[PDB]
Design a protein around this ligand. Sequence first.
Ligand SMILES: CCCCCCCCCCCCC(=O)O[C@@H](COC(=O)CCC)COP(=O)(O)O[C@H]1[C@H](O)[C@@H](O)[C@@H](O)[C@@H](O)[C@@H]1O
Ligand SMILES: CCCCCCCCCCCCC(=O)O[C@@H](COC(=O)CCC)COP(=O)(O)O[C@H]1[C@H](O)[C@@H](O)[C@@H](O)[C@@H](O)[C@@H]1O
Ligand SMILES: CCCCCCCCCCC(=O)O[C@H](COC(=O)CCCCC)COP(=O)(O)OCCN
Ligand SMILES: CCCCCCCCCCC(=O)O[C@H](COC(=O)CCCCC)COP(=O)(O)OCCN
Ligand SMILES: CCCCCCCCCCC(=O)O[C@H](COC(=O)CCCCC)COP(=O)(O)OCCN
Ligand SMILES: CCCCCCCCCCC(=O)O[C@H](COC(=O)CCCCC)COP(=O)(O)OCCN
Lengths: 75, 75, 80, 159, 79
Amino acid sequence: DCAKEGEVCSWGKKCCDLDNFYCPMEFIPHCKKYKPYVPVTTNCAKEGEVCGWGSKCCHGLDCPLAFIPYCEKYR
Amino acid sequence: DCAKEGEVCSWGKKCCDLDNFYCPMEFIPHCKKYKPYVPVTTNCAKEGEVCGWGSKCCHGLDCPLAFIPYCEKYR
Amino acid sequence: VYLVFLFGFSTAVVTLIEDGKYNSLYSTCLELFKFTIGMGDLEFTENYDFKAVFIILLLAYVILTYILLLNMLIALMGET
Amino acid sequence: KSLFVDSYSEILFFVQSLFMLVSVVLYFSQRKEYVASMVFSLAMGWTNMLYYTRGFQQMGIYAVMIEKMILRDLCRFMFVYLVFLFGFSTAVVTLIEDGKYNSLYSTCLELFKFTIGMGDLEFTENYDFKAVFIILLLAYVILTYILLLNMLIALMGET
Amino acid sequence: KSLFVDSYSEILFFVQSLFMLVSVVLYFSQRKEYVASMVFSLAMGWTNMLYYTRGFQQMGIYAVMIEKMILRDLCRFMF
Ligand SMILES: CCCCCCCCCCCCC(=O)O[C@@H](COC(=O)CCC)COP(=O)(O)O[C@H]1[C@H](O)[C@@H](O)[C@@H](O)[C@@H](O)[C@@H]1O
Ligand SMILES: CCCCCCCCCCCCC(=O)O[C@@H](COC(=O)CCC)COP(=O)(O)O[C@H]1[C@H](O)[C@@H](O)[C@@H](O)[C@@H](O)[C@@H]1O
Ligand SMILES: CCCCCCCCCCC(=O)O[C@H](COC(=O)CCCCC)COP(=O)(O)OCCN
Ligand SMILES: CCCCCCCCCCC(=O)O[C@H](COC(=O)CCCCC)COP(=O)(O)OCCN
Ligand SMILES: CCCCCCCCCCC(=O)O[C@H](COC(=O)CCCCC)COP(=O)(O)OCCN
Ligand SMILES: CCCCCCCCCCC(=O)O[C@H](COC(=O)CCCCC)COP(=O)(O)OCCN
C-alpha cells in the first residue's frame, strides 16, 4: 500500500494521494503535504527598481536578464 | 509588410497571418498554407498485428517500442 | 566491453522498475544508450517505488561508462 | 595491506555473494526491500564477466589498462572534483533556499548534471539573488567542465 | 613582482578574509547584500583546501599541474 505523511518513502513504497502529498528528494525522504501558494507582497521591488540583487519583484512585473536588471511591465 | 502565399519568406520578410502560413525549412522557403487534417484512414494495422515494418496502427491504437512491436489498445 | 556494461545495468534497471518506459530490455537499453551520447533524461519527475536506489545505479553507470571508458578510448586512439 | 592492494577480483566475487545472501534473508523475513539487494548482485554479476578476458591476450591487456586507469587517474580526479562540487553546492544552497536548491542532495545532483552535458542554465525562475547565481554557476562551469575534465583526458593520454 | 608572479595562496587567503569583513560591515548596516559577500568567502574557502595537498606527494604534484594548466593554457584559450 501507500505511505502516509511522516513515513519514509521511495525505499520500495510510494506516498498516498498525489494531489495532497509528495515525496521530496533528500535520500531518506518523508512524505510531506503540499503547501499553498502565498502571493508576493511588500519587501518586493517595484517597477523601475533594481531587481535581482537581493530583492524580487511583485506579481505584475518581470525582471529581465541583464547585469543590473530593472523590473518592467511585460506586454 | 508581410509576404503572401507563394512569395519567398525568411530573407528579411515574414509571411502573413498564422492561420494560413508556415515558412518551411528549405533555404529558399516559400509561404505555404496549412493543409487540413484527416485521421488515420484504412491500410493501417489492426490490434494484435505487427507494426513498424512498413505499416502503422490506426488512431485508436498505439505501437510500442520493441524490435517486433504490435498494435495495442493503449490505456 | 561497452555492451557488457550496458546489458548488465539495463537488466538491473528493468528488474527494479517494471513499468513506465523501463518495461522492456529494448526500451531500457535505448534509454541508457542515450547517456553515452550526452542527451540523457535525468529528470526524476516520476514517482517510482525504488527511487534512491534507481539513482545510485544511474550514477554508477554514468561514472563507469561516460567518464572512464570514453576518455580511455580517446587515449588509446591517441596512442595508436 | 595485501587485500588493500592485491586480489581485487576475489573481493568483488565475494561481495556479489554477500548481496545474494542478504537478499535471501530479507526474502524470508517478509520484507519488500530484498529487491534492492538483489539488483546490486545482478549488476555486479555481469561486470565480473571481465574476469574472463584473461586467456585472450588483447582483451586481457585491455582489462589491465582499465584497472590502472581506475586506480591511478580516476582516484586522484574524484577527490578534487568532490571538493569543488561540495564547495559550490553549499554556496548555492545558502544563496537560494527555495526550489530545487533547498537541500544539499538536490543541489549536488543538479550541479553534477552539468559535467555530463545536460545542464539547466535557464534562469527563468524569480529568485532573490539572481545575477549572483549566474556568476557562481559560470565560475563552477569554467572550473570543472573546461579545465579539470579535459585535464583528465590529457593525463590518461600520458598514462 | 611577487604579489602576482608568486605567492598565490597568500593572496587567496587574504581575499577570503576581505570578503568576510565586507560581509560583517554590510550585516550591521542593515543591508541584505551581506549574503552576497558571505557566500563568495564560503565558495573560496572550500577551494583553498587544495593548499593542503602539499605534504602528500601525488596530490601535491597534481595540484602543481593544475596551477600550470590554468596559467599557461586556459589563459590564452579564454582570450
Ligand atoms: C554497482 C557495482 C559496480 C562496480 C563495478 C566496479 C568495476 C568492476 C570491473 C570488473 C572487475 C573484475 C576484475 O577483473 O577484477 C579486477 C579488479 O577490479 C578493479 O580493477 C578495481 C575494483 C574497484 C582485476 O583484479 P585482479 O585480480 O586481477 O588484481 C590483480 C592481481 O590478480 C595480479 O596478481 C596483480 O597483483 C595485479 O597487480 C592485481 O591488481
Ligand atoms: C569563487 C572564485 C574561486 C576562484 C578559485 C580559483 C582557483 C583556485 C585554485 C586553488 C588555489 C590554491 C593554491 O594552492 O594556489 C596555488 C596556485 O594558485 C592557482 O592555482 C592560480 C591562482 C589564480 C599555489 O599557490 P602558491 O602559494 O603555492 O604559489 C607557488 C609558490 O608557493 C612557489 O614558491 C612557487 O614559486 C610557485 O611558482 C608559486 O606559484
Ligand atoms: C560520485 C558522484 C557523486 C555525485 C552525487 C553526490 C551526492 C552527495 C550528497 C552529499 C550530501 O551532503 O548528502 C546528504 C548526506 O547524506 C548522504 O548523502 C550520505 C551519502 C553521501 C556520501 C558522500 C544528504 O542528506 P540530507 O538529509 O538529504 O541533507 C539535506 C539537509 N536538508
Ligand atoms: C567567461 C564566460 C562568459 C560568458 C558570459 C558573458 C557575459 C558578458 C556580457 C557582455 C556585455 O557586454 O554586458 C553588457 C555590458 O554590461 C556589463 O555586463 C559589464 C560587466 C561585464 C564585465 C565583462 C550588459 O549590459 P546591459 O545593460 O545589460 O546591455 C543591454 C543593453 N540594452
Ligand atoms: C557544416 C554543417 C553542414 C550542415 C548543413 C548542410 C546543409 C546542406 C544541405 C544539402 C542540400 O541538399 O541542400 C539542397 C540545396 O540547398 C543547399 O544546401 C545549397 C548549398 C549546398 C552547398 C554546400 C536542398 O535543396 P532545397 O531547395 O534547399 O530544398 C528543397 C529540397 N526538396
Ligand atoms: C550498438 C549500440 C546498441 C544500443 C541499442 C541496443 C538495443 C538491443 C537490445 C537488446 C535486447 O535484448 O533486445 C531484445 C531481444 O530482441 C532483439 O533485439 C534481438 C536483436 C539484438 C541483437 C543482440 C528485445 O526483444 P523484445 O521482444 O522487445 O523483449 C522485450 C520483452 N518484453
